[PDB]
Amino acid sequence: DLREVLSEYPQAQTIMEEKGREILLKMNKLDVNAEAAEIALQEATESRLRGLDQQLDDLQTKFARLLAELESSALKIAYRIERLEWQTREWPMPED
């Protein structure tokens, strides 16, 4: 019920969490190094996921170019082949 109410107030969440740190720290219920390991793993993953969001996007932006650099060129050579087919048609067919 607090979580739904807090959605309208994003800046108010940060103050309560900061207040939550102080109450835990005064009564020695928060290890900073253990907390930092949770934070560092999350922020490195957050940095990695943003890179992963880039990695998926950088792959997909250049993936479709390879699939389209081939289909355009596969028809250009076939257009050239059809131009080559006119004059070879006048030549007689070989026996074998």
Binding site: Q60, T61, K62, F63, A64, R65, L67, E69, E71, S72
Partner: protein, 40 residues
């Protein structure tokens, strides 16, 4: 003569964007789950 060097890059300006234009048409037919539903 200065426009001759610029009009080549102006001509190349369209062709480079068309290379990236080829990406989105292939991506559109891929990123749609509807087309993947056709493959199933």
């Amino acid at each position: 003569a200065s426009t001759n060097s610029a009009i080549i890059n102006d001509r190349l300006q369209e062709l480079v964007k068309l290379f990236k234009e080829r990406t989105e048409k292939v991506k559109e037919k891929l990123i749609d789950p509807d087309v993947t539903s056709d493959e199933e």
